[PDB]
Design a protein around this motif. Sequence first.
Motif, PDB file in Angstrom:
ATOM      1  N   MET A 434       0.940  -1.247  -0.142  1.00  0.00           N
ATOM      2  CA  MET A 434       0.015   0.046  -0.079  1.00  0.00           C
ATOM      3  C   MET A 434       0.876   1.216   0.144  1.00  0.00           C
ATOM      4  SD  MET A 434      -2.282  -1.592   3.011  1.00  0.00           S
ATOM      5  CE  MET A 434      -1.035  -2.269   3.820  1.00  0.00           C
ATOM      6  N   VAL A 435       0.654   2.150  -0.932  1.00  0.00           N
ATOM      7  CA  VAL A 435       1.357   3.196  -1.065  1.00  0.00           C
ATOM      8  C   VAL A 435       0.487   4.468  -0.716  1.00  0.00           C
ATOM      9  CG1 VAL A 435       2.797   4.932  -2.453  1.00  0.00           C
ATOM     10  CG2 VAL A 435       2.841   2.292  -2.719  1.00  0.00           C
ATOM     11  N   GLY A 436       0.983   5.351   0.155  1.00  0.00           N
ATOM     12  CA  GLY A 436      -0.013   6.709   0.288  1.00  0.00           C
ATOM     13  C   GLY A 436       0.718   7.833  -0.462  1.00  0.00           C
ATOM     14  N   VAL A 437       0.021   8.211  -1.386  1.00  0.00           N
ATOM     15  CA  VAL A 437       0.468   9.288  -2.181  1.00  0.00           C
ATOM     16  C   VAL A 437       0.181  10.862  -1.500  1.00  0.00           C
ATOM     17  CG1 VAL A 437       0.349  10.608  -4.472  1.00  0.00           C
ATOM     18  CG2 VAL A 437       0.490   8.130  -4.476  1.00  0.00           C
ATOM     19  N   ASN A 438       0.909  11.726  -1.352  1.00  0.00           N
ATOM     20  CA  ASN A 438       0.880  12.978  -0.890  1.00  0.00           C
ATOM     21  C   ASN A 438      -0.366  12.937   0.237  1.00  0.00           C
ATOM     22  OD1 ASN A 438       2.623  15.086  -1.953  1.00  0.00           O
ATOM     23  ND2 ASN A 438       2.082  14.161  -3.775  1.00  0.00           N
ATOM     24  N   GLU A 439      -0.390  11.826   0.930  1.00  0.00           N
ATOM     25  CA  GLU A 439      -1.392  11.592   1.887  1.00  0.00           C
ATOM     26  C   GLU A 439      -0.736  10.707   2.864  1.00  0.00           C
ATOM     27  OE1 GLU A 439      -4.075  12.472   4.471  1.00  0.00           O
ATOM     28  OE2 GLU A 439      -3.842  13.301   2.526  1.00  0.00           O
ATOM     29  N   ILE A 442      -3.848   6.103   4.826  1.00  0.00           N
ATOM     30  CA  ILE A 442      -4.410   5.535   3.506  1.00  0.00           C
ATOM     31  C   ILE A 442      -5.512   4.229   3.844  1.00  0.00           C
ATOM     32  CG2 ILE A 442      -2.707   5.829   2.073  1.00  0.00           C
ATOM     33  CD1 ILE A 442      -1.641   3.087   2.695  1.00  0.00           C
ATOM     34  N   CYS A 447     -10.903  -0.827   0.036  1.00  0.00           N
ATOM     35  CA  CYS A 447      -9.546  -1.208  -0.582  1.00  0.00           C
ATOM     36  C   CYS A 447      -8.665  -2.206  -0.043  1.00  0.00           C
ATOM     37  CB  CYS A 447      -8.562   0.122  -0.570  1.00  0.00           C
ATOM     38  SG  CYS A 447      -9.256   1.489  -1.289  1.00  0.00           S
TER      39      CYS A 447
ATOM     40  N   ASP B 135     -10.811  14.524  -1.783  1.00  0.00           N
ATOM     41  CA  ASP B 135      -9.312  14.620  -1.929  1.00  0.00           C
ATOM     42  C   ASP B 135      -8.325  13.642  -2.334  1.00  0.00           C
ATOM     43  OD1 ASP B 135      -7.631  13.540   0.082  1.00  0.00           O
ATOM     44  OD2 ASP B 135      -8.704  15.067   1.543  1.00  0.00           O
ATOM     45  N   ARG B 136      -8.849  12.439  -2.044  1.00  0.00           N
ATOM     46  CA  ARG B 136      -7.895  11.315  -2.509  1.00  0.00           C
ATOM     47  C   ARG B 136      -8.620  10.272  -3.480  1.00  0.00           C
ATOM     48  NH1 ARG B 136      -7.154   9.445   3.789  1.00  0.00           N
ATOM     49  NH2 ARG B 136      -6.733  11.444   3.901  1.00  0.00           N
ATOM     50  N   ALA B 138      -8.322   6.282  -4.960  1.00  0.00           N
ATOM     51  CA  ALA B 138      -7.423   5.115  -4.733  1.00  0.00           C
ATOM     52  C   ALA B 138      -7.250   4.322  -5.998  1.00  0.00           C
ATOM     53  CB  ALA B 138      -8.429   4.176  -4.161  1.00  0.00           C
ATOM     54  N   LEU B 139      -6.282   3.769  -6.225  1.00  0.00           N
ATOM     55  CA  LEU B 139      -5.715   2.937  -7.247  1.00  0.00           C
ATOM     56  C   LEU B 139      -5.295   1.544  -6.912  1.00  0.00           C
ATOM     57  CD1 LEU B 139      -3.883   5.713  -9.277  1.00  0.00           C
ATOM     58  CD2 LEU B 139      -6.150   4.553  -9.902  1.00  0.00           C
ATOM     59  N   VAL B 475      -2.900   1.903  -4.142  1.00  0.00           N
ATOM     60  CA  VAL B 475      -2.241   3.114  -3.988  1.00  0.00           C
ATOM     61  C   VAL B 475      -3.137   4.287  -3.998  1.00  0.00           C
ATOM     62  CG1 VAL B 475      -0.855   4.752  -5.683  1.00  0.00           C
ATOM     63  CG2 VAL B 475      -0.571   2.235  -5.806  1.00  0.00           C
ATOM     64  N   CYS B 476      -3.129   4.594  -2.694  1.00  0.00           N
ATOM     65  CA  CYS B 476      -4.159   5.923  -2.235  1.00  0.00           C
ATOM     66  C   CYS B 476      -3.568   7.145  -2.856  1.00  0.00           C
ATOM     67  CB  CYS B 476      -4.326   5.828  -0.808  1.00  0.00           C
ATOM     68  SG  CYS B 476      -4.838   7.528  -0.380  1.00  0.00           S
ATOM     69  N   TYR B 477      -4.030   7.653  -4.047  1.00  0.00           N
ATOM     70  CA  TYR B 477      -3.489   9.000  -4.437  1.00  0.00           C
ATOM     71  C   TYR B 477      -4.183  10.159  -3.772  1.00  0.00           C
ATOM     72  CZ  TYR B 477      -1.214  11.384  -8.291  1.00  0.00           C
ATOM     73  OH  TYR B 477      -0.534  12.240  -9.076  1.00  0.00           O
ATOM     74  N   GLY B 478      -3.264  10.703  -3.041  1.00  0.00           N
ATOM     75  CA  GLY B 478      -3.973  11.933  -2.272  1.00  0.00           C
ATOM     76  C   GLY B 478      -3.470  13.176  -2.594  1.00  0.00           C
ATOM     77  N   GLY B 479      -3.697  14.130  -1.935  1.00  0.00           N
ATOM     78  CA  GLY B 479      -3.289  15.417  -1.982  1.00  0.00           C
ATOM     79  C   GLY B 479      -3.884  16.276  -2.869  1.00  0.00           C
TER      80      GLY B 479
END
Lengths: 480, 480, 68, 65
Positions: A434-439, A442, A447, B135-136, B138-139, B475-479
């Motif tokens: 699990m990757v948290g992007v700019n957050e 997660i 998910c 704001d986020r 998910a992938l 992959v939690c795309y955030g920000g």
Amino acid sequence: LAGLSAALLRTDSFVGGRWLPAAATFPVQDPASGAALGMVADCGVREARAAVRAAYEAFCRWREVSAKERSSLLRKWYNLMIQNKDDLARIITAESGKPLKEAHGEILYSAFFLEWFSEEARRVYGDIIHTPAKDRRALVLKQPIGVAAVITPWNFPSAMITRKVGAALAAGCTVVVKPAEDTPFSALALAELASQAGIPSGVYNVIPCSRKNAKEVGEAICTDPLVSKISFTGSTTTGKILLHHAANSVKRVSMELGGLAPFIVFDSANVDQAVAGAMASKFRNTGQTCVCSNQFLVQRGIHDAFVKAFAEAMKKNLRVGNGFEEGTTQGPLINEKAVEKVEKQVNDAVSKGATVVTGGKRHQLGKNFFEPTLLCNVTQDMLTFGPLAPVIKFDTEEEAIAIANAADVGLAGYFYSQDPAQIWRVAEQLEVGMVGVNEGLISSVECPFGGVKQSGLGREGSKYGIDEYLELKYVCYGGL
Amino acid sequence: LAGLSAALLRTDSFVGGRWLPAAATFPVQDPASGAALGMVADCGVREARAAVRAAYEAFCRWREVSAKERSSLLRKWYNLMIQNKDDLARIITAESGKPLKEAHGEILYSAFFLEWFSEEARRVYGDIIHTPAKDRRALVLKQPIGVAAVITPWNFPSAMITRKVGAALAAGCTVVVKPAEDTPFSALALAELASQAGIPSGVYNVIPCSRKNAKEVGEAICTDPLVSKISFTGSTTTGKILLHHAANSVKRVSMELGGLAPFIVFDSANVDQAVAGAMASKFRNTGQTCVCSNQFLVQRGIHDAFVKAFAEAMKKNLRVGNGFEEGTTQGPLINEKAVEKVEKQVNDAVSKGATVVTGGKRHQLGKNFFEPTLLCNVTQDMLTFGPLAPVIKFDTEEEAIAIANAADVGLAGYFYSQDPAQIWRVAEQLEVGMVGVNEGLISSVECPFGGVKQSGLGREGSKYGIDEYLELKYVCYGGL
Amino acid sequence: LAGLSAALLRTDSFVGGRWLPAAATFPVQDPASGAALGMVADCGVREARAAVRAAYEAFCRWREVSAK
Amino acid sequence: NDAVSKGATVVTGGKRHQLGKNFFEPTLLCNVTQDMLTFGPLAPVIKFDTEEEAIAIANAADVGL
């Protein structure tokens, strides 16, 4: 402290539909005030071979109910949790130690798991494959695996039990649950709620037991041949051992173990946000989570500008104190040996080059309390579940990965980076689950949570989780 | 006998792209004529820690090629097999012993596995889940597990290697293969074909080794930490042991072990067809298959009318003889200890009540040859991979299942029944992994092969098989 | 026999300021009539390494109070 | 099972009752040859000829309750 509903609280393990007191009990105490919280039934093996039974038998019939029916029960349960948040909450803070908010935080994240799986239960789809031979028609049904052993950690006494069992029962299985004696009440409180919801006796069981039997019962349920499945979340050691017990009976399995958590901050990375996630990740529950952003990796450019900005935010709002205490950010760690795991690391760092930036000694409340800490110049030759985040300076993205991907750990990793491109590369090469992007947080019931390479097997939650409890049965329909 | 292309044949294990002879060799003989078939490289552990390397390294780069690219290579391979059927065939008959037809039978069923997976490789789909928080985003990507250890039985020296590896490489993984020294040539012949097809060195390896090292190499590849996965097909014993080696390193796994196979014939069941499948199931390869319809269960009504009709068909066309010999139905069993596994059972049956109906002693060619057999009155207190099918009389459908479902065996089960209703009930309550309806052969590259409860883990083939080689990365795309 | 104030009587060991019941108990009887006098908390080592703590910490501060 | 499996024409019941747990449906078997000899609701019948034999077997010594 007290004041909760006598029902939501329990001490006699719940097996087959009814409460059942253990031959002998074991005490549970608020890891904060020390105040004793009654004696809990301490289930011994003899009970498991008995819990695994009433769990089995409950299956032979639950495997029957209309998926719509089980989806109905789950919901009816998800409700009972929601209509109890504020009491189900205290139960957690009181045994986990964690701030009251984080309790509700968990309680919802828990019910929400029953909720979702309640929906999934009605969508297990078989297939209809086309094959050469004109005379035969191929079919594929998916069916429940049967009984399932469930062991859960202490840090999420409710969410860790709900996310597995929700699915488990979604696919029509029966579960036997051995919670962490640190926090066993939330496991029983569920039990109470499940009964009220109307869950058929034996579909969901709880069997508290302290260390003394944690090893015994361990194999007890992970061996008993009525258990066709095993779901576990915990330490790498324990896990590897259960396998050894499941191997002997080729059981189905899914585990999510420990695993550090790299939090890579690049230069294009916004600091206030990077310092955002940073805080919420390594200080939630007081940095006592599997997905606890372990070692922060920062790019020279924004490095110093980070820590300064980071440490400053800590002092600003990390109020160490009691869980039920208003305006509290950090709480106790579990227990004595825990404050020692932090203490250790902290000294082997200072002693081997680590310019402490904030805190460093046991908090002035002692016991299981520690003042959060930040160190830097922390050279990798020093790698711990505690409110402690060490910063490591790096140069290249390649290196930042190179280190983060210091193999044999694939739980969750986070990184901040305003470059659209750099996002994809980092996030894909990141050997994790699990990757948290700019957050920095997660969490999400919809998910897939789980790790890779030795950090676990299978996933929990999401359209993908309920599979952990199904077996595929191809059926070649011929004679046509 | 000989006459094949020197290329399709091999004796030096194939590692990293090039042939490599083993310190010492081990002989392989046609289980029929006894004629020696050259010495094969006998790989010792030192080679594995070396094969697992060039397998790893090959991965670090294969994980890169466009799925379209790998789909291209596979096809290019599937072709090379197809353009070699008649030679790739002999290779099997010669080492497996089985009739030449059944060889082609295997060879196609093999290539067809590369073929299919070649297609699947281009369809590994990630998801895009919707979540609360505005704001986020998910992938979910799916990615190759890395290196994969592959051990294959002797009875299907090509199809058993192809079905795993096809998928393995479909999801972009690297494989190290230890075939059954009984039939290791088909494993190397592939190797040759794969190279010609253009498979990048180290993506597909073969390391022959006899018993002496089968135990050693065993853990050698099932432990080596570069192996993140293990696929195996074989005996329950061996399997359970590998787990014990994978546990130690929480590896990914999928196994399909032995498992009897109930062939329930009901009254509504058409006899000529029931006797159809019946024959093709327990006499293919000479009843030497995991999915070998073990014990026939017949309903009193059609019972006697069955056997008579059954045995009569045997004599009519079960021509025992050499594999390459024209008009041959049965072939050798593997080896001496095998004809003894049959011999045993056959006597403990006659001796304990079993009116033999056809054959019963070693065939008059001796060695590893046995005349097929049929017994009845065979009371369940007598439960073997050999051309031997025992009939068991029953009354109720409930009982027929009751017995068939004599738990801890979930490979493949077959039943004939003209009642539309009875089909569904039987076929669903049947605790197995594959059910053959009014058909006796349920092979198919597009369907999910595997068992349940102790007969295995995971599946092979079908839109569902390539998953055995992927790991999900949320992959939690955030920000945002 | 009985009749005393519920407070003066106890059964849960007293550590760090507050009562704390033992995992398991042990009986105490009037060495005269034999009459059982409730089960007392039976402290096991795990408690000592914990009692010796809250005892220590209490010191680091008691060492401070005015002798008066 | 060691009876059915070794010759015992069950006459009533034979499996755990449909309440499970510690519940069992009473049972009756016959043709139960002596080579199968239990405190449970299960009575097996054994055919005999002579009174002498009937005793001969019953008096299968080391049991006198």
